[model samples]
Target: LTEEQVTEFKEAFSLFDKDGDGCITTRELGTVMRSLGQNPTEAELRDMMSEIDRDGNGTVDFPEFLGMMARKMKDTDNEEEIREAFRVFDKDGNGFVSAAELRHVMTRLGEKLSDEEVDEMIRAADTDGDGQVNYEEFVRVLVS
Candidate 1:
C-alpha cells in the first residue's frame, strides 16, 4: 500500500473498531471485511490471525497495528517501487489480480500450491469473489 493506502486502512480500522477502544477484535475484523467488501470465512479470518500469531496478542492495539501496516512499508516509499511490487502480480498490466492469474502467480512462488491454499489466500486478499481485487485493496492486504 502507498501512503493513501495506510490512511485508508486507518480509515477502515477506525470504522470497524466498534468499541472505539483502539483495539482490533476478530468481531471487528469481520465487520471490516464486510466494509472492505470481502467474504470473510471462518478459515480466512483464522488465517488473518495467523498473521496475527506472528507476534503480539491476538487482539491488536491501534498504535502497534498501525505501526505494522504503515512502518513495514518504510523500505519503499516511492510510487515506482509500490507500482512494481503491485505489477509483480499484474504483469499483464491488468491493474488487478485474478483468480486464474493468481493461481498461476501464487503457484509460481512455491513451485506448487494446493487449490485449497490458493483459494484461501485469494479469499483473504480479495474476498469479493468476482472482483478478486479491485485495486488498492489488493495492495493493502499485501502491504498489511
Candidate 2:
C-alpha cells in the first residue's frame, strides 16, 4: 500500500481500538466490519481474525493489521507487472515456465536451488496436470 493508504488504514485502526490500546480485539473488528455494511458471518469473522492475529492472542496488533491489509490490497494494475516477471522466467517463450527455466532464472538472479526444490516449487505453482506453470497458474500462485 502507498503511504497515504497506510495512514488512512492506521486512522481506521485507531478508531477500532476502543480501549486506546495498541491492539484491537475481535469484537471491535466485528463492530468495524458491521459499520462498513459488511455483515460477515461468525465463520467469516473468525477466518479473518485468524488471518490477521498471527500470535493467536485474540487481538490484532498494528503491524499484523498493516501486513494483512497490504496483502489484501492486490490491485489489478499489478497483473501486468506480474506477467512481465513471469516472462522473464519463461526464457523459452513457450508461455509456460518449466522447472529448468525457473532454476536458470533464479541462478541468474544470484540464487541457487536444488533440482528437487525447483521441481517442488513448480508443482506448487502448476495448478494444471501439465508439468509447467502457465500465466494463469503463475498469477494464481502470486496473488493468492
Candidate 3:
C-alpha cells in the first residue's frame, strides 16, 4: 500500500478503535457501521468480524482491517459488479439514474439526503451535464 493509503487507513482505524486499544471490538465496529449509515444485522456483523479477525483474536487490528479493506476495494473495482450496483440503483432501468431514483434509494438505505445533497451528488458524477447519472458516471463515482 502507498504511504498515503496507510496513513488514511491508520486514521480511519483510530476512529473505529473507540477505546484507544488499537483493536476494533464488535461494539466499535457496529458504531462505525451505524455512523456510516449501514444497518447490518447481528449475524452479518458476526460473520464480518470472524472473516476479518484472521488470528482468532475476536477483534480486528490495523493489519486485519487493512487486509479486509483491500479485498473490498478489489471486489468493488470489478466492472461488472459496478454495473450491477448501478443497475440496482437505476430502478427505472432507463440507462440512467435520475435524481428521484437516487433520493429514493438513499432514503431506503436510511440516508435521508436533502435535495441539495442529491443535486451535488449528481453534479459530481454527471460529467456530461445530463442531469442524471449514467452507468459510466456511476462507475466513475465508485472508483473515484
Candidate 4:
C-alpha cells in the first residue's frame, strides 16, 4: 500500500474505534447502521455481532481488528489491491461502510435486493431503533 493509503487506513481504523476506548461494540455498530437507514433481523444482527466479537465478548478491540485485517490480507494476493478495495468500500467518507451501504454494493453486484429484501436485511442488521447500520455491525456481516 502507498504511504498515503496506509495513513488513511489507520485514520479509518481510529474512526471505527468510536468511543476512544480502543474498541468497538455491537452497540456502536448499530448506530452506524441506523445512520444509513437500515434495520436488520435479530438473527442476522447476532450473526454480524459475532463476527466482530473476536474475543467472544460481543465487541472488538483494536488488536482483534488487526487480526481480522491480517487474516484478510493473507487472503489477498496484493496489499495494494486490498487497500484500494477497502478505500472504495468506505463509500460515504465516514471511514466505514454501514450494513445498508454494503447491501447496496451487493445489489449493484447483482444480489437482487428487493424492497422487502432490504427491509429484512435492515431489520437483521439494525440493532438500534435509529434505523441504520454502523461500522462494527457492517464489517461483521460484510466480512462474513
Candidate closest to the true structure, highest lDDT: 3
Candidate 4 lowest-lDDT run of ten: 77-86
For 23-96, candidate 3 gives per-residue lDDT tens digits of 99888889989999999987888888999999998999999999988887777668677888899899989999
Higher-lDDT candidate of 2 and 4: 2
What lDDT, from 0 to 1, does candidate 4 have?
A: 0.66
Clashes by residue pair, model 3: none
Q: TM-score winner among the candidates?
A: 2
Off by over 4 Å in 4: 1-7, 78-144
- Give the Å error, residue 115, model 2: 25
**Candidate 1 per-residue lDDT over residues 1-144, each given as its tens digit:** 577876787886677678998877777788778888787887787778557443557776655567666665665565557676667777577777766677787766775777777677778777566646656767677567
C-alpha root-mean-square deviation, candidate 4: 16.9
lDDT of 3: 0.90
Model 3: lDDT of residue 27: 84
In angstroms, the error of model 1 at 36 is 2.9
Candidates ranked, most accurate by TM-score first: 2, 3, 4, 1
> On residues 49-95, what C-alpha lDDT tens digit does candidate 2 reach at each position?
89889889878999888887777676544876898999999998999
Runs in model 1 lying further than 4 Å from the true structure: 1-12, 52-55, 78-144
TM-score of the candidate numbered 1?
A: 0.41
Q: For every model shown, what is its TM-score relative to the native structure?
A: 0.41, 0.50, 0.49, 0.43
* Preferred candidate (lDDT higher): 1 or 3: 3
The Cα local distance difference test for each model comes to 0.70, 0.87, 0.90, 0.66
* 44-69 per-residue lDDT for model 4 (tens digits): 76788788677798777766676666
